[PDB]
Each structure stands twice: as C-alpha cells, then as structure tokens.
Amino acid sequence: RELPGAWNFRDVADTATALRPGRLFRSSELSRLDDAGRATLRRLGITDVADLRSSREVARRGPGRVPDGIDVHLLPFPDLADDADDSAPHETAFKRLLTNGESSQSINDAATRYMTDEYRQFPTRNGAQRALHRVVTLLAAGRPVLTHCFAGKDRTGFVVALVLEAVGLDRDVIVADYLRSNDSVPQLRARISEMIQQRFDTELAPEVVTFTKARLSDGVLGVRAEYLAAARQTIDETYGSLGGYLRDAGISQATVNRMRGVLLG
Ligand SMILES: O=C(O)C(=O)N(Cc1cccc(Cl)c1)Cc1ccc(S(=O)(=O)NCCC(c2ccccc2)c2ccccc2)s1
Numbered sequence: 001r002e003l004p005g006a007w008n009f010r011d012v013a014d015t016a017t018a019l020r021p022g023r024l025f026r027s028s029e030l031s032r033l034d035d036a037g038r039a040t041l042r043r044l045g046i047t048d049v050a051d052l053r054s055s056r057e058v059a060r061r062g063p064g065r066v067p068d069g070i071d072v073h074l075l076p077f078p079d080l081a082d083d084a085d086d087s088a089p090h091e092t093a094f095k096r097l098l099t100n101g102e103s104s105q106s107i108n109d110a111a112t113r114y115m116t117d118e119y120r121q122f123p124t125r126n127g128a129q130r131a132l133h134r135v136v137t138l139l140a141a142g143r144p145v146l147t148h149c150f151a152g153k154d155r156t157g158f159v160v161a162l163v164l165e166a167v168g169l170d171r172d173v174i175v176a177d178y179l180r181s182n183d184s185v186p187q188l189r190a191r192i193s194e195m196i197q198q199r200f201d202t203e204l205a206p207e208v209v210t211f212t213k214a215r216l217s218d219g220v221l222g223v224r225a226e227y228l229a230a231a232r233q234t235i236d237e238t239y240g241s242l243g244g245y246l247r248d249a250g251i252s253q254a255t256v257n258r259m260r261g262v263l264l265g
C-alpha cells in the first residue's frame with residue numbers, strides 16, 4: 001500500500017489490528033502528492049488531513065496537494081509566533097546537530113542527543129496539544145484522518161502513539177507501528193538529499209553540500225523506542241498520566257471513550 005508522491009504511508013490498523021481499517025492514517029508530507037496519490041486519498045475515504053509541519057516548513061515546501069473535498073487542518077508543531085525568541089531554541093538545536101567531529105560515532109551521538117532532547121520537550125511544546133486535541137476530536141466524530149509532518153516519523157509518531165495509548169492499545173503494538181517508520185529511511189534520505197541539492201549551490205559550495213549530507217543521512221533519519229519513551233516520561237513526570245495530559249490539552253475522558261468506540265473493532 002503506497003501513496004504516490006509521498007512515503008512512510010500506512011493505515012495504522014495495518015499493524016494495530018485491534019483498530020478498524022480506514023480510520024487513522026499516517027504519512028510524510030503531501031507536498032509532492034501526484035494524481036495517483038490524490039485518487040488514493042479519495043478511494044480510502046479520507047476527509048481530513050492533520051498537517052503538523054511548522055508554518056515555516058509549509059511556507060518553504062508548500063501546502064499538501066490534496067484533492068477536492070479534503071479539509072487540511074494546519075496544526076503546526078512547533079507552533080511558532082513575530083518573535084525570534086520563539087524560533088531561536090529550534091534553530092539553535094538544529095545548528096548544534098549540524099555543527100558539533102567528522103567521525104560517524106560523533107555524528108550519530110549528536111543525532112541521538114538532538115532527537116532525545118527534542119522528544120523530551122514534545123508534550124510541553126506549543127502546538128502539540130492543539131494538534132492532538134483536533135485529531136482526537138475529528139476521530140471521535142467518526143472522520144477518517146491522515147496525520148503527517150515532514151518525515152511522518154517523530155511528530156507524527158508522537159501524535160499517533162498517544163492516540164493509540166488513549167484507545168487502550170498495548171505498548172508493543174504502539175511501538176511496532178512507531179518503528180515501522182525505519183522501513184522508509186532510504187526514501188527519507190533521498191528526499192533530504194534532493195532538498196540539499198536545491199537549497200545549496202552544488203558547484204560553488206560542494207563542501208557545504210558534502211558536510212550537510214553527512215549529518216542528514218545516517219542515524220538521524222531513524223526512530224528508536226527510547227525517543228518515544230523520553231516524550232512519554234515527560235508526560236508521566238509532569239501530568240501523572242496520559243489522561244492528565246489529554247485533559248490539559250482540553251480533551252475529556254468522555255471524548256476519549258467515544259474515540260475508542262469509533263476506532264476499535
Ligand atoms: O527549508 C525548509 O524547507 C524548512 O522549512 N526546513 C528545512 C528542513 C525541512 C525538513 C527536513 C530538514 Cl533536515 C530540514 C525546516 C528547518 C529546519 C531548520 C531550520 S533553521 O532555522 O535552523 N535554518 C537552517 C536550515 C538549513 C538546512 C535547510 C535544508 C536542508 C538542510 C539544511 C540551512 C539552510 C541554508 C544554509 C545552511 C543551513 S529551518
């Protein structure tokens with residue numbers, strides 16, 4: 001099951017078999033969705049898209065190329081305010097990942113540090129709870145939803161895993177679906193490489209192209225159970241339970257119980 005023009009696409013029920021098929025989907029960005037990809041979204045009955053990319057990402061790579069009749073909910077994560085102080089932490093963390101030195105071990109140690117520390121902050125970050133609130137509300141209402149970001153692996157992974165835990169699925173099932181993102185690493189690598197080739201002059205700055213590709217092609221493209229567990233520990237420590245977290249995000253147990261009624265076989 002492919003989604004032409006996009007990658008890392010699956011019906012979450014493909015691995016989480018307790019779920020009804022056709023309710024909750026996940027993918028990469030839909031910036032390059034082609035005719036066949038659009039026909040697929042329609043065939044599957046998907047009515048709503050949750051676009052988790054920051055507004056900066058959407059501006060630079062474009063809106064989802066969805067067919068008519070599909071509402072795209074823009075659900076930026078992080079949701080950044082005219083405020084350089086707001087974006088600074090994100091820019092600084094990315095710069096450190098890139099510019100921390102040449103060995104694969106050091107490059108991948110930096111990727112592990114970056115990813116882990118960002119996941120730890122996922123629950124408390126502006127935009128994550130609004131994203132989760134909308135996705136849960138749409139799902140509880142019986143609407144088939146496709147949730148995505150850029151890679152569809154971390155931000156998307158976090159939102160999906162919380163939805164699955166909310167409807168009562170076990171850890172091994174949630175983690176299995178989460179790790180499925182690793183099957184798309186080579187494709188992600190190619191997408192990012194093509195992006196590097198266009199944002200940089202490959203003739204006049206080939207050293208920068210080479211340096212950058214070396215930090216955006218290996219360990220940093222995967223997911224690991226420890227990443228998700230770090231977000232999940234934040235939820236535990238600060239909110240005391242997933243239910244406590246969902247309530248702070250404005251979602252009641254009654255809405256959760258309705259979503260469970262809808263999503264489970
Ligand atoms: O350009 C876009 O497209 C976009 O909005 N991005 C870039 C991006 C999107 C998806 C995946 C990756 Cl790895 C990067 C989101 C960003 C991530 C980090 C930033 S930043 O504020 O730290 N600016 C540095 C971007 C950086 C870069 C962009 C694309 C690919 C590799 C590196 C960069 C751009 C130009 C010169 C040097 C570094 S902006």
Ligand SMILES: O=C(O)C(=O)N(Cc1cccc(Cl)c1)Cc1ccc(S(=O)(=O)NCCC(c2ccccc2)c2ccccc2)s1
Binds near residue numbers: 054087091152153221
């Ligand atoms: O969620 C995904 O799946 C996903 O698309 N990514 C982007 C990515 C893919 C491959 C390699 C890298 Cl380094 C990043 C993985 C993420 C890394 C970090 C995050 S984050 O939610 O903690 N911060 C995301 C906003 C950020 C950013 C966008 C694209 C790529 C890198 C970082 C950002 C937004 C605006 C200015 C600077 C940085 S999400």
